[PDB]
Ligand binder design. Structure first.
Ligand SMILES: Cc1cccc(Cl)c1NC(=O)c1cnc(Nc2cccc(C(=O)N3CC[C@H](CC(=O)O)C3)c2)s1
Length: 287
């Protein structure tokens, strides 16, 4: 009854063409749907009851949503095996790898526009009573219009399948303190994560906290340290990400506030020309 919203697609409408993701229990393909490019995720024979519930539950959750910044479900193949979930095809893949492969290639306005799209998707999820728990640039997909869409939906499968999530099982350095310390995951802990995504975007995919271990990150945060300004970062953007990292959940902006601020900055783009000071790590001097 969450699945009866989803379209059942017949296997002869679907051609898998190239592997673009993979795991032990299936893979993701670029393909064509009856013609239109699509992404195709499979679940291999022998799957458990829990695996079937998790897998079709991702499609069930995605089919409840209709928003420009949330990956769109085309349908499912469940009456034939292997079972499949079919979605729109995002031509530029995961945002973290995309940024690292395109370092320096975008304007500051383009980067901020990507953040506004992610925030808009997150406001929608939050208002739909969906807590993501694993918001990170690796879980955002980018299309050929530079539109960023939130992906990676489900219940326990989200944190269980993410290699960044370490033994609870949590992607520590994207996660808010209260979610680490007492398992309180809410839209406000997703705002903390969004602050981290802001920093990943503005740095072209630098790894948060560099080589600090998970314990060192948790200790730094609890002692009040925060990530430093990216290079060439608008002051308003650094101010906003810093407010996402308030220790006190109630002091963080809501996604509604984030979308509003980002929309105003984009509409007055000269506001983005004032840069936060960058703390240089190397001094170079010449006589
Ligand atoms: C299918 C599905 C099921 C459940 C949940 C979700 Cl979110 C999805 N949908 C997806 O996973 C995806 C939708 N679009 C995706 N696009 C994607 C992912 C990873 C890499 C790429 C990508 O940029 N390329 C692979 C093909 C191209 C390289 C080549 O053509 O040789 C570049 C695209 S994945």
């Amino acid at each position: 009854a969450v699945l009866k919203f989803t379209t059942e697609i017949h296997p002869s409408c679907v051609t898998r063409q190239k592997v673009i993701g993979a795991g032990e229990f299936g893979e993701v393909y670029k393909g064509m749907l009856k013609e239109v490019p699509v992404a195709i995720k499979t679940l291999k024979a022998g799957y458990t009851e829990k695996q079937r519930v998790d897998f079709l539950g991702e499609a069930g959750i995605m089919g409840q949503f209709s928003h420009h910044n949330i990956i769109r479900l085309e349908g499912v193949i469940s009456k034939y095996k292997p079972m499949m979930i079919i979605t729109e095809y995002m031509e530029n893949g995961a945002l973290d790898k995309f940024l690292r492969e395109k370092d320096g290639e975008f304007s500051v306005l383009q980067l901020v526009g990507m953040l506004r799209g992610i925030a808009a998707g997150m406001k929608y999820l939050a208002n739909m009573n969906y807590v993501h728990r694993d918001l990170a640039a690796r879980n955002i997909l980018v299309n050929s219009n530079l539109v960023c869409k939130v992906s990676d939906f489900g219940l326990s499968r989200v944190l269980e399948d993410d290699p960044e999530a370490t033994y609870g099982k949590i992607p520590i350095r994207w996660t808010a303190p209260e979610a680490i310390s007492y398992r309180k995951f809410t839209s406000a802990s997703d705002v903390w994560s969004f602050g981290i995504v802001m920093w990943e975007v503005m740095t072209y995919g630098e790894r948060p906290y560099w080589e600090l271990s998970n314990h060192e990150v948790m200790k730094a945060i609890n002692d009040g340290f925060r990530l430093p300004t990216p290079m060439d970062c608008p002051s308003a953007i650094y101010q906003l990400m810093m407010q996402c990292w308030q220790q006190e959940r109630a002091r963080r902006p809501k996604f509604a506030d984030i979308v509003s601020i980002l929309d105003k900055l984009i509409r007055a783009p000269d506001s983005l020309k004032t840069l936060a000071d960058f703390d240089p790590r190397v001094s170079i001097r010449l006589p």
